[PDB]
Paper text:
Extensive classification of the data for the mycobacterial ATP synthase revealed the presence of not only the three main states referred to as S1, S2, and S3 but also of substates within them. Substates S1a to S1e are in S1, and S3a to S3c are in S3. Thus, as the structures of γ-subunits are highly conserved, it appears that there is a conservation of an energetic mismatch between the two domains that is independent of symmetry. Thus, as illustrated in Fig. 3 and Movie S4, by using the c-subunit directly under the ε-subunit as a marker, the rotation of the ring can be tracked through the substates. In S1, the rotor turns almost one c-subunit onward (ca. 40°) from S1a, in the direction of synthesis (anticlockwise from above) to substate S1b, which also moves the γ- and ε-subunits relative to the other states. The positions of the top of the PS suggest that the order of procession is S1a > S1b > S1e > S1d > S1c. As the inhibitory tether is attached in some of the particles, this movement of the rotor in S1a and S1b may also be responsible for additional differences in the F1-domain and the PS compared to S1c to S1e. Each nucleotide binding site in the three α-subunits and in subunit βTP is occupied by an ATP molecule with an accompanying Mg2+ ion, while the site in subunit βDP has ADP and an accompanying Mg2+ ion. The sixth nucleotide binding site in subunit βE contains an ADP molecule with neither accompanying Mg2+ nor phosphate. During rotation through S1 in either direction, the γ-subunit approaches very close to the PS at b′Arg72, and potentially a salt bridge could form between this residue and either γAsp170 or γAsp171. Unlike the tether, which can be formed in any of S1 to S3, this feature can form only in S1, when, during rotation, the γ-subunit comes sufficiently close to the PS for a salt bridge to form.
The membrane domain of the mycobacterial ATP synthase is embedded in the IPM, with the catalytic F1-domain of the enzyme extending into the bacterial cytoplasm and attached to the membrane domain by a central stalk and a peripheral stalk (PS). As do other ATP synthases in eubacteria, chloroplasts, and mitochondria, the enzyme couples a proton-motive force (pmf) across the IPM generated by respiration to the synthesis in the F1-domain of the enzyme of ATP from adenosine diphosphate (ADP) and phosphate by a mechanical rotary mechanism. The mycobacterial rotor consists of a membrane-bound ring of nine c-subunits, attached to an elongated central stalk, made of single copies of the γ- and ε-subunits. The mycobacterial PS is made of two proteins, bδ and b′.
Numbering used by the authors:
A (entry chain d): 1 to 50
B (entry chain N), F (entry chain M), G (entry chain O), H (entry chain L), I (entry chain P), J (entry chain T), ...: 3 to 86
C (entry chain a): 10 to 247
D (entry chain H): 3 to 120
E (entry chain b): 22 to 60
């Protein structure tokens, strides 16, 4: 139980670190890829229109 | 005297040697690989990303030895072969 | 008290022992991977924007295909792509599930983990290593004949080093297994040691080690996949 | 003491003794002292040259696409365009920074380094 | 006792691995390659 | 003779080996990585900002192999496995 | 004192030496080869594809030696020669 | 054979190993860092001050091992763990 | 105790030292030679064929020593000299 | 066996290890620093004097460790902790 | 206890140390010399035949030490000095 | 057993360790310094004399340390502290 | 048992350490000096005659260390100090 509390606190610290300093850049990368592919699709559509 | 005592002392010394060798090897190998990475980044700033692939390929390799040693260390101290 | 090893849920069938804990962890990892795969199959869109799962899967596929193209060429060995990607995802999820907080007091001062990464069990790593071994050796046999392939591997780059060469042929699987095994095995032991401190001190070393172990698992999965691809290429030359 | 010669394409600019020649080659900074070894290097695209003399003030030069050659006796600096410290104008140099053209920004950076504004 | 010794689990894990590969080779890699080639 | 005496002596020798190897590895690896860092900074004064990233990575791994050793030594001398 | 106990302790110490030496050699050799590979990849991006052919020859020669040692370590600890 | 005698002999051997490893690592790492610093001064003599920042970041990171390594040695010989 | 037991423990430790030294030498020498080979191939891709002729010569001199060393280990362990 | 005999034998072994490690570290570190100094003086003869300030800082940083070991070694072999 | 047993055990340990040191020296020296030869052939292919004269010298020296060790190690084990 | 016998055995082991460490340090350091000197000569025919000054200093800082070990080795072997 | 047995066993172990360290130092130092010589000859073909001198000085230092160790091992083994 005591070690369970210790490891739970450790996991809370790990999750805080991840959300603070790891989630933001990864979310940015995912949004960047999604925007890039969306722009590629839209540019293909306008090329077909042209 | 208890023979298991002698066997346990031998196993502890053996595991000490295991991890001593593993530590020396891993520390020096990681230092050398990091020296290569830092020199490459300083000399070729644009290649900063490109170097992170081989570097870890090196790390994951060198540390192997250490960690493998670590495993056998346990086998010596926690599951001493021939302890009887 | 550590009790290194000592798998729980151990049962017997067909005159053979089975580590129930590792079976359960492997099954959970497989279920997670299959859930991700089937979710992707319900979200693959070549027209609209891709979801995060599609992004992750295609990132893995591009990395593995780039390695194959740079090493042996996709046309020669296409199966290497699914093999490497499944190996990578399996190992990665197995090692990363450990981060979840499951260690707890065993009512006698001995830490117990509900989930322990299967790679910490020799059976898992041996299974993956031997499967890869058989796979790329069969690929080499098919590529350059049943009799030519052993000649090619024994001869190596220089015939004089024939006794040396055979060793790597044996060392390739073992190195693949042990390299993984220890890297995950330590993860099991360290936390156990970190369990000896009082709860008000265990959190900091525990947090640091688990943060490092996330990275260790990621790198180990990457190394295993990359070396599998490289061995496949090396056995399918000429 | 070593003989420093700032030589441009259109004309030989400057020649004289000096006590220490600082500059920034491609790999990194460098300092030349009297008996430095023979050397041939390329100055960074926005390089600056500081010639410290005996009994005189430091000579700061903004260099455009230059080269450096340490010989057994003399140091020769080649320059498409080298501008001495007194001739720089802060306004134009600072304005040339961040420009779309890379050469213009490099020249502005060289002027700023020569001035000391960095 | 000498955890390095293999066991019956070796086979079971293989089973659980193979099916995963079977899924990946069927419903992941081909569709993803198709999407990439189409893009 | 007391079995515990022999076991503890073996544990002490083992831990001595553990930290001998760990200190050798950590010192030499940090020295090599720092040599890379110092060279890079000496060439480019402004490269400092982009060099602490790889350097602190190289230290990290090289330090892990140290501290891990430390931990196991703490097990050897304070919780000696196999101590009868 | 059960001479088998003395033989087992000696075999454990010998295996510890074997794996410590193998670990040092493998770690340092892999580190040096990785340094070469990282520097080569830094000097030109294209070489990443081809440089792996020689690099993984070196790691092949290095690792093999280590693993040979590992093999004999088993022979030392699992089937101790001259165990009486 | 007083158990304390064997315990103290083992502790002294362990502490000797502590010193050996710490001294080797500290000396070699410090020499490597100093080599980097000396080369930096030789290349551009007026970078000395600027280089004292990374240098002390390395030296301490090396000495941090040594002194830490040293501390436990004082623990072995003066307050021996597991002393009967 | 049985003289053969003490002699066998000594032989096992000696063989362990033999293999540890051989593995350290082989691993580090192979790593260094491979580093040279990798750098040479990176600089001159056409030299890939040529550099194999000297490189393996080095591997001939390094491995051979290790193997010779390995040989004597067998002599120590399987037919122990002076074993009475 | 008089316990003091075992204590002093362990102390002598520990002092030998201390001196061996210290000498290895001092020799190799001094060699590396001197290599840097020779290369620098070859590059810039007039930086010679200005090159001694870092060199000594390196040497004093290295040599000191050596002497520290020596000091402790004296304590090991002249006022042995735990001696009866 | 048949004092010759301890004589033989010590002789085998000493011979193992001799072989380990000789193998480490030979392996690392041959690796370094081969690195020099490989780099020289890579950068100046025409100088191939020119570089083997010094190389055969270097290797020679290196190998010489190794071979000397062999002889002395034989002396330790086959005709152990000090046999009663 | 005569306690002085144990003292002398420990003293011999300590002296052997001192000599091993000193010789390793001396060989490595002198090799590195000589490598620097030879490279400097190769770059500059006429830089020979001016390079011998620093080189000798390096040798002085290495050999001296080595010879210091020699003294203590004698103190260990001939005038063994703690002998009784 | 016979004290001289323990004395001779310790002497053999010490001599083995002496020669192992001497061989390591000699091999690696000679290899490094030969690397410098080979690289210099590759850079400047005409430098062979001039380069031989500093190379011979370095090899002389290294071999002097090695042969001093050889002499002191011969002292330890053939005429063991402190022998009763």
């Amino acid at each position: 139980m005591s070690i369970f509390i210790g490891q739970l606190i450790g996991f809370a610290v790990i999750a805080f670190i991840i959300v603070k300093w790891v989630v933001p850049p990864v979310r940015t990368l995912m949004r960047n890829q999604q925007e890039a592919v969306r722009a590629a699709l839209a540019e293909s559509a306008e090329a077909a229109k042209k | 005297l208890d023979p298991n005592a002698i066997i346990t002392a031998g196993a502890l010394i053996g595991g000490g040697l295991i991890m001593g060798g593993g530590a020396i090897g891993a520390g020096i190998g990681d230092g050398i690989a990091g020296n290569a990475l830092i020199s490459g980044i300083a000399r070729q700033p644009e290649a900063q990303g490109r170097l992170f692939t081989p570097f870890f390929i090196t790390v994951g390799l060198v540390e192997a030895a250490y960690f493998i040693n670590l495993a056998f260390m346990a086998l010596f101290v926690f599951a001493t072969p021939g302890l009887q | 008290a550590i009790h290194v090893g000592h798998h729980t849920l151990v049962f017997e069938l067909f005159g053979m022992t089975f580590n129930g804990d590792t079976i359960l962890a492997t099954a959970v990892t497989a279920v997670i991977v299959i859930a991700l795969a089937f979710y992707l199959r319900a979200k693959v869109t070549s027209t609209g924007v891709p979801s995060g799962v599609q992004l992750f899967w295609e990132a893995l596929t591009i990395q593995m295909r780039q390695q194959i193209e740079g090493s042996i060429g996709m046309k020669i060995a296409p199966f290497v792509l699914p093999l490497s990607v499944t190996i990578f995802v399996f190992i990665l999820i197995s090692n990363w599930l450990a981060v979840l907080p499951l260690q707890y007091g065993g009512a006698d001062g001995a830490a117990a983990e509900l989930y322990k990464a299967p790679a910490s069990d020799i059976n898992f790593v041996l299974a993956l290593a031997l499967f890869v071994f058989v796979c790329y050796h069969a690929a080499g046999i098919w590529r350059r004949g049943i009799v030519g392939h052993p000649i090619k591997v024994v001869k190596g780059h220089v015939a004089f080093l024939a006794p040396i060469n055979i060793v790597e042929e044996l060392a390739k699987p073992i190195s693949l297994a042990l390299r993984l095994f220890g890297n995950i095995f330590a993860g099991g032991i360290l936390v156990a040691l970190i369990a000896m401190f009082p709860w008000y001190i265990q959190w900091f070393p525990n947090a640091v080690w688990k943060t490092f172990d996330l990275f260790v698992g990621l790198i180990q999965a990457f190394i295993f996949s990359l070396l599998t691809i490289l061995y496949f290429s090396q056995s399918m030359e000429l | 003491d070593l003989n420093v010669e700032i030589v441009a394409v259109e004309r030989e600019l400057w020649s004289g003794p000096a006590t220490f020649v600082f500059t920034r080659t491609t790999a990194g900074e460098i300092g030349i002292l009297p008996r430095h070894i023979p050397l041939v290097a390329q100055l960074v695209d926005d390089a600056m040259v500081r010639v410290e003399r005996e009994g005189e003030d430091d000579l700061r030069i903004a260099v455009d696409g230059g080269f450096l050659s340490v010989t057994e006796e003399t140091v020769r600096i080649l320059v498409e365009n080298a501008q001495f410290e007194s001739e720089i104008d802060a306004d134009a140099a600072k304005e040339d920074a961040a420009s779309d053209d890379e050469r213009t920004a490099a020249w502005g950076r060289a002027r700023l380094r020569a001035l000391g504004q960095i | 006792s000498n955890f390095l010794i293999p066991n019956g689990t070796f086979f079971a894990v293989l089973i659980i691995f193979l099916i995963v590969l079977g899924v990946i080779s069927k419903w992941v890699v081909p569709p993803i390659s198709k999407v990439l080639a189409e893009r």
